[PDB]
Symmetry: C5
Subunit: 114 residues, 5 copies
């Protein structure tokens, strides 16, 4: 598996606008909401769960990087894998998207896969 | 279990106004006091205790997040489970609430379960 | 044991003014000095040693919180247990106080046991 | 092995201009892009991958240091070992360079193996 | 062993002016360069290696404290043990000094052993 697999999805020129931390099934988790830097479009919601999914190994690195980009407000590309989380009330509150990567973006491109 | 279980309680549009770190019965712990951003209501107190209660796995994540939201003064939703801590002097100083989640808030919503 | 045990000692309305990190007996340790926010009184010195005393489990949380309050310069209540450290040159440089808690203070009260 | 081995390569007077975090083949990784502080030259890209390559033990220290130098934007010397990553889509997006060291370039010259 | 052993050396009122992170013999390490706050004298260089020397246990605490003092620019007392590192190209680049402690300094005296 790789963040950049074309079976994942990504959204460019976004800003992390909200942050949530909690616990589910004895696992810490966090979620972020991102919006376009220009405010257009629909928010992207993605979560990472410390003990669950093939992306569990990257939990701490992604939590620290989400916190960093949240604090700076800078433009990023957010990479997700769709249809991962399945607890129905959790998906209703957040989404089924697993967070799988974060890339900084300049005005002309983003530093990350496609 | 989940932060968003309907048997937990939550308080929206709160500001983390105080922070305390200590040790009890071999466990580092922290407590926070939150107050409504608009001055309404009565303060909420919640604590997380390392290696104690079902919420133990998220101790470090919640401590780091509470420190961040405390440092910014931003409005948050605080999620608790009531009647968890039983040590009587501790409860009298702080409360029996276990901290189980923290959510950022916007002008119209908070980014977490309700 | 608890930070708030009345056999411990505390000092309100203090500012963390100095910070030292070192090693002793293969254990990382740190010490702080605090002074009254209003400039009066006698400084308080307290140390924490990663592998020593009943307070060892809280070493990392107290170090992070000491660094936080040191960086903000805000007024705090410092909680200690007297007569813990015993190596004479160490006590002469610093003190025998073990650090056991740190509480934020407002103008009127401190958020911690009293 | 050593960061300063002559078989490694380095680039002075660079600024960390982009940062990416993801996961590949069970491993969290990060990549950085650096450009000459004075605007000349060609960017350098380097990556560190947890639990992969001989440089695995320093993954967390290099991630933390890359973040710090990225946040200040100060001039640095980046140390790499060429031709380490072989995953072809990854190399095309980023590079085959393993990040093996970071040195400040305050004042006089770069504070690292030369 | 202790940071304050009289067989160690220390240098007061120093400013951390450079920082380097790398790897050697499968161990992360860092080095700092310090200079007197008034610019007199000659620089002090010291390094910490995570898996080597009796000071290995305090590697992370020292790296975190070095980063903090490097970012503030405040005057510190640096404590070292001489003639510890032995790889010749490493010693010639940096020094043989092991970093063994870091103390903040008031306007009149440093907060650590002397
Ligand atoms: C490397 C390469 O060949 N092309 C990339 C390319 O991805 C991208 O070009 C377009 O740039 C605009 C704004 O910069 C958008 O980025 C475009 O749409 C994308 C995006 O956000 O990147 C593409 C993405 O695949 C889409 N994801 C899904 C699930 O559909 C999203 C999504 O539709 C929207 O984001 C929702 O609002 O849109 C993109 O085509 C740029 C980006 O920097 O860089 C090129 O090099
Ligand atoms: C390929 C695909 O999309 N899904 C398959 C699916 O056939 C199946 O799903 C998993 O199987 C059982 C229940 O049938 C597990 O209980 C998983 O449920 C949980 C889990 O405990 O792991 C419940 C948990 O609440 C979920 N966490 C959240 C935040 O929602 C997790 C989580 O979605 C997964 O762990 C993510 O990978 O799932 C259930 O998903 C199994 C059977 O082979 O395989 C899937 O791939
Ligand atoms: C994987 C592991 O280590 N432990 C899981 C364990 O988490 C799981 O417990 C369930 O976890 C879910 C979240 O994933 C909920 O927190 C459940 O709370 C319940 C409850 O226990 O009463 C269940 C569910 O949320 C609801 N009722 C159901 C499914 O019947 C109610 C809730 O009030 C709703 O509002 C009504 O829909 O709360 C909790 O049971 C257990 C059981 O799946 O499995 C372990 O593997
Ligand atoms: C009438 C009047 O106003 N007298 C003032 C008085 O307000 C004040 O006394 C101190 O006030 C602070 C208020 O935060 C504390 O209540 C001090 O009590 C404590 C403390 O919390 O710091 C109690 C504690 O048990 C004591 N610790 C030990 C080991 O004995 C400490 C300690 O004695 C002092 O902190 C050391 O300086 O005191 C209370 O003493 C002061 C000035 O504000 O003195 C009068 O002017
Ligand atoms: C030989 C000499 O000159 N002095 C030693 C003295 O160092 C030491 O004192 C006592 O030893 C018993 C156990 O033998 C206690 O454990 C205490 O020792 C130590 C310890 O646990 O290592 C010594 C250590 O230096 C102390 N650490 C600091 C920072 O001061 C700790 C510490 O106070 C406690 O751990 C706190 O709970 O205590 C001490 O009572 C012994 C060495 O055999 O004998 C003297 O002669
Ligand atoms: C203790 C442990 O876990 N592993 C060591 C292992 O690190 C050590 O390897 C030597 O490490 C030193 C630094 O301490 C040098 O990096 C040596 O590097 C070499 C190199 O990597 O190529 C070896 C030799 O000196 C030269 N190259 C060879 C023989 O291929 C070059 C040359 O000096 C540089 O180019 C200088 O610019 O450096 C490395 O062998 C081994 C052997 O000491 O012992 C393990 O236990
Ligand atoms: C003034 C003139 O005529 N030409 C200058 C030229 O002298 C100068 O070259 C660079 O100067 C800097 C000074 O810090 C470095 O010394 C560069 O050396 C190194 C470097 O450390 O960056 C050495 C290193 O071994 C080289 N790495 C590799 C893989 O070969 C790098 C690398 O070639 C360059 O960094 C790539 O751009 O160079 C030295 O080259 C500069 C002015 O600063 O450019 C001309 O104007
Ligand atoms: C508990 C563990 O894991 N290891 C300890 C080990 O740390 C300890 O070594 C002693 O540690 C103390 C600090 O706790 C000092 O660093 C000691 O240095 C001394 C020394 O050289 O012996 C100790 C003492 O203060 C003095 N020695 C005397 C009076 O004989 C000298 C002093 O500075 C003068 O220079 C002497 O003329 O410093 C160090 O030995 C050992 C022994 O306690 O126990 C292990 O278990
Ligand atoms: C004779 C003199 O002038 N000084 C000596 C010194 O040369 C000598 O070297 C030590 O001897 C041991 C014996 O096994 C090893 O050779 C040590 O090797 C290494 C190691 O641990 O791998 C090599 C390594 O590269 C070194 N790391 C760095 C950053 O340089 C480490 C490190 O220095 C030690 O671990 C420090 O504790 O050492 C080598 O140090 C011995 C002779 O006993 O000490 C002086 O007297």
């Amino acid at each position: 598996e790789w963040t950049g697999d074309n079976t994942n999805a990504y959204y460019s020129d976004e800003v992390i606008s909200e942050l949530h931390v909690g616990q589910i099934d004895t696992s810490p988790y966090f979620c972020i909401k991102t919006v376009k830097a220009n405010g257009s479009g629909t928010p992207v919601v993605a979560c990472a769960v410390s003990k669950q999914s093939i992306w569990a190994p990257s939990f701490k690195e992604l939590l620290d990087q989400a916190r960093y980009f949240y604090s700076t407000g800078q433009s990023v590309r957010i990479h997700v894998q769709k249809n991962i989380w399945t607890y129905p009330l959790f998906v209703n509150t957040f989404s089924a998207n697993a967070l799988v990567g974060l890339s900084s973006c300049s005005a002309t491109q983003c530093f990350g896969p496609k």
